[PDB]
Structure 1
Amino acid sequence: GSQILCVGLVVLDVISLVDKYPKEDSEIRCLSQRWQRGGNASNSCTVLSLLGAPCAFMGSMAPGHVADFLVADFRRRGVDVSQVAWQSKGDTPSSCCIINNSNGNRTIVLHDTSLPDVSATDFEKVDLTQFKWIHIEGRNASEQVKMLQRIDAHNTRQPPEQKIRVSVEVEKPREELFQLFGYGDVVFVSKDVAKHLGFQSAEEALRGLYGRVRKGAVLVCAWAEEGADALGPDGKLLHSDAFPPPRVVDTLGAGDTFNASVIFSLSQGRSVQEALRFGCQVAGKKCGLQGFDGIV
C-alpha cells in the first residue's frame, strides 16, 4: 500500500518554443524545439516521481516507436508502467505545443487518435492493495464512474487505517464529466471549467460547486497567478497566493504539477492549507523552467 496511481492520458508533446505567439497566416522561426512526454495523468506521474513518491501510470498506449519513447521516459523517471492498457487499434496521440517564451503561455493542438480509453474492465483487473492514493483524470466519464464505485467498495471492506484515498480532475468544460464531482475525497476543477460555467473567481466557483461533491470531500480550484483555493466540509474557504517566478517561461503542465503536488502533500498527511501552498509552490517553480527537470 505504498504507491500512488494516476489514471488518464499519455501524449507525445511535440514542443516549439517561440518568442512571441505567431499571428494567423504568418510565419516565424522557433527559438528551440523538444519532444516531451505529456497528457495530464502522465505529467502528474513525472512530478510525483520527482518528489520521491512511488507512482504508477495507467492509460492506453498503442505499440510503436512513439510508445517506445514514452515508455523509455516513464522508466528513467521510475514510473511503474506495468498497468498500461496496451491497444491494438489506433495510434498514440500527439500534440503540437507552441510555448510563448516571453510569458510561458502554451497553446496546444491535440490530435486525439481513435485510440480507445481505459475502461471499467481494464480497471477491474488491477490490484488495489498496492496503492495509498488513486487519481483519475476525467476523460471517459460513465466508464470511470464505475472504476470509482469499485474503489469505494474496496474501501468499505477496509479499516480507516488503510482505505485508498481518491482524487478526481475535471479539467475540461464537458457535460459527461460533471457527474464526477460526486466522487473522490479531493476534487480538482479547472479555471476553464469554472469560467465556462458562470464563475470568474476561485472563491465563487467553490461556493457554487460544493453542493455537487461527495459528503466530506475537499474541492480545489487553482486560478493561475491568482493562486488556488480549497473548500472542505467545515465550510471555511482556504487560500494560497501563487509563487510566480520572476520570469515565467513555460506553463505547459503547470496545472498537472499543481495537482500532483497537492496529492503528494496530502498523501503525506499535511493539512489542506499546507498542501494548497505546496501545490502553488511547486507549480510556480516549474513555470520558471522548460520541462520538469529542476523543480527539485
Structure 2
Amino acid sequence: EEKQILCVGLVVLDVISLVDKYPKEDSEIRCLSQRWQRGGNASNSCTVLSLLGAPCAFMGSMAPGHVADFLVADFRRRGVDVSQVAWQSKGDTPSSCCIINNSNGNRTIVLHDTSLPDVSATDFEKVDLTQFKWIHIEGRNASEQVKMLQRIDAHNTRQPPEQKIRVSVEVEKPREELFQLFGYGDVVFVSKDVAKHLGFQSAEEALRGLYGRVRKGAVLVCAWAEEGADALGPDGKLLHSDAFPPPRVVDTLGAGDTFNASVIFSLSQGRSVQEALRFGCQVAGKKCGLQGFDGIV
C-alpha cells in the first residue's frame, strides 16, 4: 500500500528578500533578489515529500483570496493535493516577512498568524483515513490535534498490522500546551529551540531527558542544525548522524522542514532509523546550499 502521506499544519505566504548583510534600523537598502515562496512547516514538508517522489496531501486552514490562489496554484504545481484544506468563510491566509542573509543563510521571520481558525477535530473527522499510509501533524492547536490523534488511533486498532497508519508529530514551538503532543505518534520531532527552552544543551541530552514523555514504542527525533541529528527509540540506544554541510550555506529557511519530510519519507520507505537520520541530514544539508527547495533532488 503506497498510499499518500498527509501533513496537517500551517500554509504561509513567505515574502522573501535576499540581502548581503542584515539591514540595520531605519536604513534603506537594495536587495539581491526577492521572491514569494509557499511556506509553513507542514506545507514545506509536503513540498519536499513531493520532490522525493511521494504522493502527499496538505491539510490546513486557508481563506479565499489572492494569497490563497497563489498558494493553491503552487501546491498543485508541486503535485501536493489540497482537497482536505479547511476553507474559512472570512479572514486572510497567514503570511510572513522574511529576510535571508545570503552570506550565511540566516533567516529572519516576521510572521502574521491571522486569527484564522485552525483545523478542528470536526474538520479532521471528515477525512477518509483509508487514503493515507502516514499522517504527520505540526503541533499547533494541541487540544484539538489530540482528538485527531485519538481518531487515528481508534482507526488503527481496527486495522491489520500492515494497514495501520504511521503517525508523526512535530513539537516546534516552546509553548506549554504543545508538550502533551509528546505522548502521541510513532515518531516525535522535537526542535532544537524547544530542547534549549527546556534546559538541554544537546540533542543527546534532550533525547535522554524527554523520552519518558513519548508513547511506549515511539521514536524521538531531535535535529541540531550543524551538529547533525539524533534519535532515540525503545531499545534505549542513542542514534546520531552528522550534518552534511554544503560548500556555501545560503538559505536555511525551511531546513528543519526538509529534514522532517526526509525522515518521514525514509521511514515510510521501510528504512531504519539510522538510515532515516542520515538521509534527513543529507537532503536538509544540501537544501541549505540552495534558495528554496528546487534542486534538492
Q: TM-score range by the shorter chain?
A: over 0.9
How much does 1:229 deviate?
0.1
How much does 1:24 deviate?
2.8
How much does 1:166 deviate?
0.1
How much does 1:41 deviate?
0.4
Structure 2 distance, partners of 1:160, 1:273, is 23
How much does 1:249 deviate?
0.3
Structure 1 distance, partners of 2:173, 2:63, is 24
How much does 1:76 deviate?
1.1
How much does 1:97 deviate?
0.4
Instruction: Confirm whether residue 62 of structure 1 aligns to residue 63 of structure 2.
Output: yes
Identity of aligned residues (%): 100
Structure 2 distance, partners of 1:218, 1:59, is 25
Structure 2 distance, partners of 1:169, 1:259, is 8
Structure 2 distance, partners of 1:224, 1:72, is 31
How much does 1:27 deviate?
2.8
Structure 1 distance, partners of 2:200, 2:21, is 30
In structure 1, what is the equivalent of residue 76 of structure 2? Answer: 75
Greater shift in the superposed pair: 88-97 or 163-172: 88-97
How much does 1:82 deviate?
0.4
Residue 263 of structure 1 aligns to a residue in which SS? helix
What TM-score does the superposition give when structure 1 sets the normalisation length? 0.99
What TM-score does the superposition give when structure 2 sets the normalisation length? 0.99
Residue 252 of structure 1 aligns to a residue in which SS? coil
How much does 1:26 deviate?
2.7
Structure 2 distance, partners of 1:7, 1:111, is 19
CA deviation string 1:13-37 (max 9, x = no partner): 0000011112233332211100000
RMSD, matched Cα: 0.6
Residue 53 of structure 1 aligns to a residue in which SS? coil
CA deviation string 1:172-210 (max 9, x = no partner): 000010000000000000000000010010101000000
How much does 1:60 deviate?
0.4
Structure 1 distance, partners of 2:91, 2:116, is 4
Structure 2 distance, partners of 1:104, 1:141, is 31
In structure 2, what is the equivalent of residue 250 of structure 1? Answer: 251
CA deviation string 1:67-119 (max 9, x = no partner): 00000001011111100000112111100000000000111000111111000
Residue 219 of structure 1 aligns to a residue in which SS? strand
In structure 1, what is the equivalent of residue 96 of structure 2? Answer: 95
How much does 1:169 deviate?
0.3
Structure 1 distance, partners of 2:226, 2:161, is 37
How much does 1:271 deviate?
0.2
How much does 1:48 deviate?
0.2
Residue 81 of structure 2 aligns to a residue in which SS? coil
In structure 2, what is the equivalent of residue 261 of structure 1? Answer: 262
CA deviation string 1:139-183 (max 9, x = no partner): 000010000000000000011111000000000000010000000
Structure 1 distance, partners of 2:195, 2:209, is 9
Structure 2 distance, partners of 1:146, 1:27, is 48
Residue 221 of structure 2 aligns to a residue in which SS? strand
In structure 1, what is the equivalent of residue 137 of structure 2? Answer: 136
How much does 1:46 deviate?
0.2
Structure 2 distance, partners of 1:43, 1:273, is 23
How many pairs align?
A: 295
Gaps of 5+ in 2: none
Structure 2 distance, partners of 1:292, 1:177, is 28
Residue 102 of structure 1 aligns to a residue in which SS? coil
How much does 1:218 deviate?
0.2
Structure 1 distance, partners of 2:7, 2:256, is 15
